[PDB]
Amino acid sequence: SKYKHTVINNSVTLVLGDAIQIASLLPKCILVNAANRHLKHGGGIAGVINKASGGDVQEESDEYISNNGPLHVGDSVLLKGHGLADAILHVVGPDARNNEDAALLKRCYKAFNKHTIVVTPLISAGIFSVDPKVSFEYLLANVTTTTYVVVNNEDIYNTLAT
Numbered sequence: 725s726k727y728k729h730t731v732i733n734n735s736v737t738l739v740l741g742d743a744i745q746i747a748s749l750l751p752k753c754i755l756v757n758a759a760n761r762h763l764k765h766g767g768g769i770a771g772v773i774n775k776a777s778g779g780d781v782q783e784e785s786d787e788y789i790s791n792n793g794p795l796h797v798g799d800s801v802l803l804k805g806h807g808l809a810d811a812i813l814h815v816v817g818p819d820a821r822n823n824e825d826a827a828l829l830k831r832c833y834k835a836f837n838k839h840t841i842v843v844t845p846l847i848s849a850g851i852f853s854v855d856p857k858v859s860f861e862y863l864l865a866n867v868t869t870t871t872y873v874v875v876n877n878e879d880i881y882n883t884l885a886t
């Protein structure tokens with residue numbers, strides 16, 4: 725009720741705000757990180773998640789990548805929450821700058837469905853250069869669990885809420 729939000733369907737609510745703040749409000753949730761294949765948390769939400777954890781997220785991510793090797797595009801990994809959420813689901817969206825197809829967002833978003841409550845940004849819609857409407861369409865087509873899709877730009881919010 726405190727946020728500009730639009731309930732889209734029985735699964736998805738679009739929220740204008742900061743995904744970290746929304747994840748903190750909910751008593752139980754998974755927070756989704758928009759990651760790269762090496763979980764090297766850069767200039768988008770990944771860096772903000774890492775900084776909010778005091779670097780704990782990057783330390784854990786490095787440990788995982790040593791155990792797994794690099795992820796494939798479209799893969800995800802459930803790691804610890806570090807007080808931000810019950811857990812963080814790191815998803816590797818396609819990077820359009822590297823000619824990776826937006827269709828791989830199907831794999832990213834399907835990974836949400838085993839989790840009861842998900843708080844997510846729009847995967848690939850920032851640095852990875854996929855149209856926010858395209859990412860949101862893949863989200864709506866594939867997500868079948870209670871999901872708060874949090875966007876921090878009001879113009880994007882207005883576009884997607886219409």
Ligand SMILES: Nc1ncnc2c1ncn2[C@@H]1O[C@H](COP(=O)(O)OP(=O)(O)OC[C@H]2O[C@@H](O)[C@H](O)[C@@H]2O)[C@@H](O)[C@H]1O
Binds near residue numbers: 743759845
């Ligand atoms: N705190 C936030 N809350 C909600 N949405 C946010 C927030 N910060 C950024 N966003 C939005 O989330 C969307 C995803 O943007 P990025 O975080 O840039 O994600 P992506 O486009 O998937 O790029 C992934 C790449 O960026 C690096 O951070 C990461 O390490 C990877 O290399 C964009 O629309 C961006 O504006």
